Design an enzyme around this catalytic site. Structure first.
Site, PDB file in Angstrom:
ATOM      1  CG  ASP A  95      40.624  84.230  82.053  1.00 17.13           C
ATOM      2  OD1 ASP A  95      41.832  83.944  81.757  1.00 17.13           O
ATOM      3  OD2 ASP A  95      40.238  85.105  81.412  1.00 17.13           O
ATOM      4  CG  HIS A 104      45.085  84.045  90.323  1.00 15.03           C
ATOM      5  ND1 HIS A 104      44.896  84.443  91.559  1.00 15.03           N
ATOM      6  CD2 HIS A 104      44.288  84.656  89.465  1.00 15.03           C
ATOM      7  CE1 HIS A 104      43.958  85.174  91.423  1.00 15.03           C
ATOM      8  NE2 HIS A 104      43.476  85.387  90.265  1.00 15.03           N
TER       9      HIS A 104
END
Length: 233
Positions: free
Chosen positions: A171, A202
């Site tokens: 995360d 990400h």
């Protein structure tokens, strides 16, 4: 930034610009690059240059043209990041898919095209890459850390051309997708290929990111390039 003068018309008359990179040698496959939440910006320009240096032509359409044409936001500037989040929250995904369709059609028809079109999308574009793979508009699609993919799993059987996805296991700002839901969902369709990067979240492929991971960026990039190579003559 966009290539001045380039105007692509979409399904409803909406027109949008694009950043275009002609190939070093013609004919070449053309890669449509689907933007992230920052618009067609410096990282997008770097991606076009990268693909041109790797033997492709590239077209990065302005998907934010329905809200604010020519939006190119600096991810290191807090106020521009806030604008990116606002634009993303208001983004119309289906219309984005229709604009990418129009950009793919444009890509297939360029004088230097070899007839093959691929698509590479990043986080915002990564989710779009999956939606485009379900529609079947390109020969090959790639999505880097596509947001919201777990929600679109029912579309797994619609994918009829290859599509490759690079998923960050950690995360960061956006949570990582469920490794289980995605792996099981994608496993049913051998045209979908997915890789997990357990040491990254990400945005790992962008050096301007606080989430940049060189080893993940490089391995993902090498898989992307090996995956796109068959498109070359």
């Amino acid at each position: 930034m966009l290539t001045e003068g380039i105007s692509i018309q979409s399904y409803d008359g909406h027109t949008f610009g694009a950043l275009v990179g002609s190939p070093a040698k013609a004919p070449a496959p053309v890669i449509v690059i689907a933007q992230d939440i920052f618009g067609v910006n410096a990282f997008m320009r770097e991606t076009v240059s990268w693909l041109v240096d790797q033997g492709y032509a590239a077209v990065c359409p302005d998907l934010y043209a329905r809200q604010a044409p020519g939006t190119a936001l600096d991810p290191q500037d807090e106020r521009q990041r806030e604008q990116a989040y606002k634009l993303w929250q208001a983004f119309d995904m289906e219309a984005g898919v229709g604009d990418l369709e129009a950009a793919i059609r444009y890509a297939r028809h360029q004088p230097y095209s070899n007839g093959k079109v691929g698509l590479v999308g990043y986080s915002l574009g990564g989710a779009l890459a999956f939606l485009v793979a379900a529609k079947g508009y390109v020969d090959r699609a790639v999505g880097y850390y596509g947001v919201g993919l777990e929600k679109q799993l029912n579309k797994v059987p619609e994918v009829k051309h290859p599509a490759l996805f690079h998923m960050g296991g950690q995360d960061h700002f956006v949570p990582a997708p469920s490794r289980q839901l995605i792996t099981e969902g994608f496993g049913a369709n051998p045209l979908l290929q997915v890789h997990w990067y357990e040491e990254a979240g990400h945005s790992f492929a962008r050096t301007s990111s606080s989430g940049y991971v060189a080893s993940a960026a490089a391995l993902a990039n090498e898989r992307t390039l090996d995956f796109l190579a068959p498109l070359q003559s």
